[PDB]
Structures are given as C-alpha cells and as structure tokens.
Amino acid sequence: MSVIKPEMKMKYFMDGSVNGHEFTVEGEGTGKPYEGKHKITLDVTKGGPLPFAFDLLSTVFNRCLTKYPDDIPDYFKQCFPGGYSWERKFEFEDGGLAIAKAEISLKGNCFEHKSTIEGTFPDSSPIAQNKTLGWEPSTEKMTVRDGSMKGDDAAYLKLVGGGNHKCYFTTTYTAKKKIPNLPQSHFIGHRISSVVNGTKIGVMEDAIAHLYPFN
Amino acid sequence: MSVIKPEMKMKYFMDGSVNGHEFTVEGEGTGKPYEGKHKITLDVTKGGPLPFAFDLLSTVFNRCLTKYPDDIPDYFKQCFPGGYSWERKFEFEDGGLAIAKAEISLKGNCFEHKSTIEGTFPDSSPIAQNKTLGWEPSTEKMTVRDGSMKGDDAAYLKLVGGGNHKCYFTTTYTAKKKIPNLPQSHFIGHRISSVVNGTKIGVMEDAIAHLYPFN
Secondary structure, three states: OOOOOOOEEEEEEEEEEEOOEEEEEEEEEEEEOOOOEEEEEEEEEEOOOOOOOOHHHHOOOOOOOOEOOOOOOOOOHHHOOOOEEEEEEEEEOOOOEEEEEEEEEEEOOEEEEEEEEEEEOOOOOOOOOOOEEEEOOEEEEEEEEOOEEEEEEEEEEEEOOOOEEEEEEEEEEEEOOOOOOOOOOEEEEEEEEEEEEOOEEEEEEEEEEEOOOOO | OOOOOOOEEEEEEEEEEEOOEEEEEEEEEEEEOOOOEEEEEEEEEEOOOOOOOOHHHHOOOOOOOOEOOOOOOOOOHHHOOOOEEEEEEEEEOOOOEEEEEEEEEEEOOEEEEEEEEEEEOOOOOOOOOOOEEEEOOEEEEEEEEOOEEEEEEEEEEEEOOOOEEEEEEEEEEEEOOOOOOOOOOEEEEEEEEEEEEOOEEEEEEEEEEEOOOOO
16 A cells, blocks of 8 residues: 555556457556546557547546545555456446456556457447447445455446436456455445547546445 | 325335245335335235245335435425336346336325335345345435436345345336426435344335435
8 A cells, every 4th residue: 555655647558449440549647546536648549539439448547546534445555566457347238348457557656557448339339339428427336255346337328318328337356465454345436537539538537435325 | 295294104015926936025114205214014924934035125115215415306206196116127146036016106194015026046046045134235326217217226235254245226216297307317325224033024224315425
C-alpha cells in the first residue's frame, strides 16, 4: 500500500479485436487513488477511428483508484508492491460477448496498464453500430473468493431514444502476492464518462467503496 | 399511492416445486411501506419441513415496501390502486435455476401476495442440501423498460466455512395501470433475514432506494 500515493500517473496500452476489427489504443493519465478519481487521454493508433462504441473499452482502461472508508480493507492498494491482474467478461443483452484482460504493474509513481480484449456482437448491436451514449452510474458487488476479489455489475448503456442496454460485468481481480487483510463483501459505486473525438479519447472515473445504506 | 399507508398488513400464499418436491407456505405480516421495513410469519402447510434452503424462498415473500427519497419517483407505490405483478429468474453459480412469480393486490389495509416458484438444482447445491446461511446485504440495480421496472441483483448466499454462493436475480415488476411518474435508474439497498424453526418461519426485510454515492 505504501507505494500507492495520493497523486499518481498512469500509462496504457491496449490491443484488441471486435468482430474481426483489430486495433491498438495507447495513452496516459493522472489520478488520486485514495479519492477514487482519475482522468485519461488516449489515442487510437491502429484500426481507428473505431467502428464500434468506445463504451465497450472505457471500463477496461484499475480498482486501485477507488475511495475506501476506514472500515473496509482495500484489497487493491494492498496489491502493491506486487502488482495484480484482472479479467472481465461482458455479457450484453442481445448476445454480444467480450472478454478483457489487464495486468497492472507499478514503477515509481506510474501505473503501467496493459490490456487486451476480444468481442463478438450481432450487426444490430448498439455497440457494433457505435451508438451507445455512455454507461449509467453503477454499483459493483464485491466479494472475496479464494484470495481474489470478484466483482458483479449490472451495467447499463444509454441509447438514442432514452432506452437502455444491459451488460453484465463479471470480473476477477487477483493479487500476485497473498493479501493480508481481506475485506468483507461490499459495494463500489462507479460513475465513468468518456468522450471520443476522431481517434482522440478522454475517460474519467469516480469510484467509491461503501456499504450504504446499512453500513 | 394514497391507498399505501404508513402502517399496513400482509397475507401470503405460496405454492411451489423444487427438484420435484411440492410444497405450500402461508402466513401474514406487518410493515411500514414508506420506511422500507416489514416482518412476516409463515407456516409450511404442505411438503414440510422443506428439504431445501428457505433462502430460495425468502425474497419471493413486495417492492412497495421500500423507502424512497423525494428525488426518485416510487414506481411501486404508484401501482396502487391497480395492483402489480413480478417475475424473478434465479440463476445460481452451480447451474441451479428457479423462476418465481407473484401477484400483489390490495384490499383495505392488507396486501394479498400470491406466488409460485419452480426450481431445479444439482444434488450438491447448498440450496438443495439446505445449508445456506442467509443472503448478504445487496444492491439491486433498477431501470425502466417499456413501463415496467427491471431489477438486477448479484445476490450472495453465506456458506458454512465462510465462503459464498452467487445467485443472479433478474426481475421484471409491472403495474396493471400505466404509471404516470416513471423514475430515473437507481439502486435499492436490501438486507433480508429469515429464521426457520421446523415448519415455522420468520422473515424481515429492510430496503432503501438511493443513488449513493453520487446522488
């Protein structure tokens, strides 16, 4: 935990394929790990402009960036020194499916985030048609299973016309060194936003762990 | 909404079958709809003592019993006069599956709740073996879809040994009369507890709607 500081920097590299379209995205960011806030700037360097919704990738671009209250142990910040990895399965309501993997390491004051994602979607999918309008704020259920954290989120995309599109996130987050203070089950409230301008993309996330309303 | 009062009474009748075992459960309760609190007493009148975990049935035994803040419309209390129904699919991590249906009507100060449930579980399931130890407090994601509320909850059962067992709840709640003030997407925090003594069973639920932490 001590190597996780109040202000940190981040670098990102992603390789992926969606419906056969290969792409590469890279960038950097800054954030406040203990406040649960960070911002990122990215560039699509291969396969741009992306022909599918960036919302599919935004949550792939680090649970160390979460505000944790004193009464809930912070598994993620305890992952350093050591590093950790995570894998998220995305199950969309129309049958769309994607799996993303990330490895997060630390050198100095910089988190190095390397990820990959593979996805397949029907042609009618609002992800395939690049027509989703962001994720609604969400609540991820956190549990512990064999020394790993498991996260379950019923995520929803906003659509043109006011409707929504469900995507289940099923994630396993795993330290590379045994975590000594495992938390009780809890929730993480999220609010992520992203903006795409051509091949330049911005992302920001606020995340707070809690046990509201019963604490 | 006006027929939903600060203190109300409840009656319950349930018919079901789990792994071929048919049963009937009946009882009554009292609660405070606007405070999001209620308590229930039940008796297994056919097929008792139940050979499977009562946790499978506890959430089947009424979203009108939820505390709603002023800034989030209360779809459920707007269902009266009129009544509503709901259907919940339960998907357990070992392949166990159940579907429950309920219809809720009102006469005077009494909610009449009639439900059915069908479930199939592998013999090794902690539900089939009647060895789960209650649900952890949860957060249900609420969205609106074509005049109905949809609820998604990543529910977890506590097990002997400290582990947990996941069950996805996918529920559709639907008024019998068009609801005039539909809510924005939101969360409902739950804490349900039940106690089984032979064929006598007690249940209590606290539920609060919210948009924490970002409101």
